[PDB]
Amino acid sequence: VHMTINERAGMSKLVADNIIASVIKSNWVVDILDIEYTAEVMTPSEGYTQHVDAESIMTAPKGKLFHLQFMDGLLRPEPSAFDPPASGEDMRLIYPLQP
Amino acid sequence: LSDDFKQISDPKGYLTYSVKYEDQFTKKDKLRASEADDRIVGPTVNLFK
Amino acid sequence: YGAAVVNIDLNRDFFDTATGIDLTKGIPLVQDLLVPIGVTAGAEQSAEY
Amino acid sequence: RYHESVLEIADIFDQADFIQTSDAVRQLRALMPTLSTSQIRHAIERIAQ
Amino acid sequence: VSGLLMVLFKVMTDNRLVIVGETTTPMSNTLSTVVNNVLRTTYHNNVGVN
């Protein structure tokens, strides 16, 4: 499903959690048009000074400005040839809807 | 020339809703939404919890 | 060398706090212009933009 | 099958003296909340202070 | 019966005259649209229940 969410307000917590669970276990894509946010664009060395739970994005007040951070991972040098293999997967949920 | 009118401000109706909850299914915790939308919608969503 | 990003921002030194603007989050943000009446506006309002 | 769009008054009037603004201010009014007169007075008083 | 009478009496003598009380005017963006369609500019803080 590509579930658009025009209005977050009145969404049940069991339902917000259920949608996010569907995002993971069933690969839903979930646009949430009600969010207004400012985006700081962090460089790879400064990492992610801020961290956000899915619960907060599904339950921010409708007028408040969220402050998302996004990596510009372009300035990130190749791994040493002998570094141990990364078994597990880096995973990512949140994306911008426009540039 | 006359005290014709008591001047109340946030008037009380002659009728109100009154609710009996089934305590087993009722959640004791107060419901919460956006703060403004709770300011309006809130007394209602609590009365008909 | 090594500049990861070069942005073009509003000059914070010019659009100072004296004008009531805060440019720290990348948009101008002014504290008490467009506001709800009868209630405190709350932090990080989008109208502040 | 209409295409709704802004149209600058400069485009229809040749009389340049009587035109000051542009599409811009309309575009900025679009970002603004519907404004109660009391809110407007507030905004003005804020800009004043 | 007498109960009804007093109720009737208490209605016949409700000389109450409303003055506007405390009333918030919410910024429109902070309201869910279903509330916005319901809201008319401003409202009493004692919203009451409907």
From Swiss-Prot, chain C:
It is found in: Virion. Inner capsid protein that self-assembles to form an icosahedral capsid with a T=2 symmetry, which consists of 120 copies of VP2, with channels at each of its five-fold vertices. This capsid constitutes the innermost concentric layer of the viral mature particle. Belongs to the turreted BTV-fold inner capsid family. Homodecamer; each decamer is made up of two conformers of VP2, called VP2A and VP2B. 12 homodecamers assemble to form an icosahedral capsid. This is Inner capsid protein VP1. It comes from Bombyx mori cytoplasmic polyhedrosis virus (BmCPV).
